[PDB]
C-alpha cells in the first residue's frame, strides 16, 4: 500500500509482460 | 478554415487510386533522406533504440505505391467498399502478396490499412473544422 512513485512505470511493464498468452 | 473543410470532405470518400496519387504527391514534396548512423557505439545501451524516422517515412510511402500497383481494379473497389472487412480477409491479402512475389501479407495489409486510416483521419478533422 506504500509503493514508490519513482518505480510506477516499471511495475506497469512487469504486469503487462507477466500475463499468460498463446504462442503465435 | 473553409478550404480545409472542402479538402477533408473530398478525402474521406477517396478511393485507392486517389491514395496512390496522394502518396505520389507526398513523395514529390519530400527530399530523399540518406540513412543516419545511431548516435552511440554498438556497446551502448541506446544503440538498439535508435530509429531512423526520416528514412522510414520515405520507404513506407514508396512501399504503399508499389503494393497498390499490383492490386487490381476489382480488388481496389472491394477495398474501398469493405474497409475493416477487407483487412481481415486473409485470403484476399495472401492473394495480393503471392501475385507480387516479394512483398508479404503483412505489408499488403498495412498498406491497405493506411489507406483507410487516411480517410478516417479526414473525417475526424472534418468534424473539428466544420
Amino acid at each position: 500500500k506504500f509503493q514508490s512513485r519513482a518505480e510506477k512505470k516499471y511495475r506497469i511493464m512487469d504486469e503487462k509482460v507477466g500475463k499468460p498468452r498463446f504462442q503465435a | 478554415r473553409d478550404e480545409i473543410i472542402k479538402l477533408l470532405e473530398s478525402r474521406k470518400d477517396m478511393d485507392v487510386n486517389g491514395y496512390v496519387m496522394y502518396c505520389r504527391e507526398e513523395l514529390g514534396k519530400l527530399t530523399v533522406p540518406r540513412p543516419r548512423a545511431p548516435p552511440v557505439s554498438p556497446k551502448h545501451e541506446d544503440y538498439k533504440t535508435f530509429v531512423d524516422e526520416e528514412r522510414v517515412t520515405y520507404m513506407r510511402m514508396k512501399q504503399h505505391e508499389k503494393i497498390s500497383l499490383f492490386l487490381t481494379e476489382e480488388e481496389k473497389n472491394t477495398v474501398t467498399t469493405k474497409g475493416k472487412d477487407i483487412l481481415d480477409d486473409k485470403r484476399f491479402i495472401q492473394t495480393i502478396a503471392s501475385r507480387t512475389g516479394f512483398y508479404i501479407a503483412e505489408e499488403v495489409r498495412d498498406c491497405l490499412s493506411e489507406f483507410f486510416n487516411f480517410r478516417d483521419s479526414s473525417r475526424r478533422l472534418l468534424t473539428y473544422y466544420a
Binding site: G18, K19, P20, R21, F22, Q23, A24 | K90, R91, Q94, F102
Partner: protein
C-alpha cells in the same frame, strides 16, 4: 491460406505441395533468428488442432488434477467435464480446449469427430523469494508457472465414457408445477 510447406512430410501419402524457400533476409540478426524458429514450428501439427498456453500461474501438480480427467475423451465430453470442476486450473484448461478447436476448424477438420489425443505440461520461469523463520533461519518462497499443450485429432482411439444430462431448475413462465391437481391422491 496455410503457411508455406518447405519440405516433404513423413506421411505415407503427400497431401500438400512443397514451395520454394524465400530468398530475402530480415534486417537484424535478432529478427532473423526469431523468424527461423517460427518457420520450424509451422512445419508441425498439420491436419490437427493444437494449442500452447504459456505462463499459467499454477503448478504442475495442480494442473494434473484436471488434465487427468479429459485424456482420451471425445471433445464434447472433455469440454463439459472442465466446466463443472470448481478449480482455478479448470478455467485455463477450458480456454485451451476452445483455442485448439478454433485452430482445427481453420485447418479444415470436423469439430464433431475431434478427440483429445495428447496433453502434457512443461516448466516455466519461476519467481524466487525468501520468507523468515524462527530463531534466525530462512526458507524459500517460490511462485511457479507452467505451459500447457493440447492436441486434437480426428478419429483417434477414444474412451467410451459418457455423462448423463439433465435440465436445470425451471424458473419463470416455463414452470408449471402450480397447475398440479392434488385431488387424485385422496382416492383408492
Amino acid at each position: 491460406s496455410r503457411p508455406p510447406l518447405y519440405a516433404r512430410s513423413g506421411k505415407f501419402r503427400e497431401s500438400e505441395e512443397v514451395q520454394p524457400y524465400r530468398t530475402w533476409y530480415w534486417y537484424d540478426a535478432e529478427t532473423e533468428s526469431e523468424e527461423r524458429r517460427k518457420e520450424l514450428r509451422q512445419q508441425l501439427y498439420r491436419d490437427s488442432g493444437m494449442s500452447y498456453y504459456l505462463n499459467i500461474p499454477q503448478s504442475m501438480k495442480k494442473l494434473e488434477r484436471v488434465v487427468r480427467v479429459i485424456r482420451n475423451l471425445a471433445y464434447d465430453e472433455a469440454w463439459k467435464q472442465a466446466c463443472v470442476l470448481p478449480l482455478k486450473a479448470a478455467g485455463f484448461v477450458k480456454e485451451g480446449l476452445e483455442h485448439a478447436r478454433k485452430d482445427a476448424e481453420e485447418k479444415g477438420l470436423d469439430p464433431k469427430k475431434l478427440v483429445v489425443s495428447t496433453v502434457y505440461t512443461a516448466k516455466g520461469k519461476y519467481l524466487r523469494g525468501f520468507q523468515p523463520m524462527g530463531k534466525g533461519f530462512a526458507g524459500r518462497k517460490t511462485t511457479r508457472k507452467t505451459h500447457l499443450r493440447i492436441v486434437l485429432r480426428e478419429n483417434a482411439s477414444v474412451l467410451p465414457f459418457a455423462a448423463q444430462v439433465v435440465s436445470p431448475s425451471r424458473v419463470g413462465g416455463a414452470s408449471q408445477k402450480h397447475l398440479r391437481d392434488i385431488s387424485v391422491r385422496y382416492t383408492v
